[PDB]
Ligand binder design. Structure first.
Ligand SMILES: Nc1ncnc2c1ncn2[C@@H]1O[C@H](CO)[C@@H](O)[C@H]1O[C@H]1O[C@H](CO)[C@@H](O)[C@H]1O
Ligand code: ZN
Length: 55
């Protein structure tokens, strides 16, 4: 089962990044391989402020 074919330029549902909410690194091609919170294709939703923001 060979793999290794994930490349999204700017028109596909990119995979959320390992730390999209805090992705400290930033490259010109990394944004195409991983999506991030704040973009139209983000899709990670890993418990980011469930319901504790009432202050
Ligand atoms: N908040 C945050 N954003 C991105 N990457 C992050 C992170 N918190 C931790 N990491 C990565 O996980 C390990 C800790 O187990 C760190 O060393 C980070 O690894 C990064 O290092 C690579 C480049 O040196 C990156 O590709 C990423 O894996
Ligand atoms: Zn990232």
């Amino acid at each position: 089962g060979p793999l290794g074919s994930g490349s999204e330029g700017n028109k596909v549902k990119r995979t959320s990044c390992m730390y999209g909410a805090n992705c400290y690194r930033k490259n010109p091609v990394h944004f195409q391989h991983f999506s991030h919170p704040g973009d139209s294709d983000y899709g990670g939703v890993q418990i980011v402020g469930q319901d504790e923001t009432d202050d």
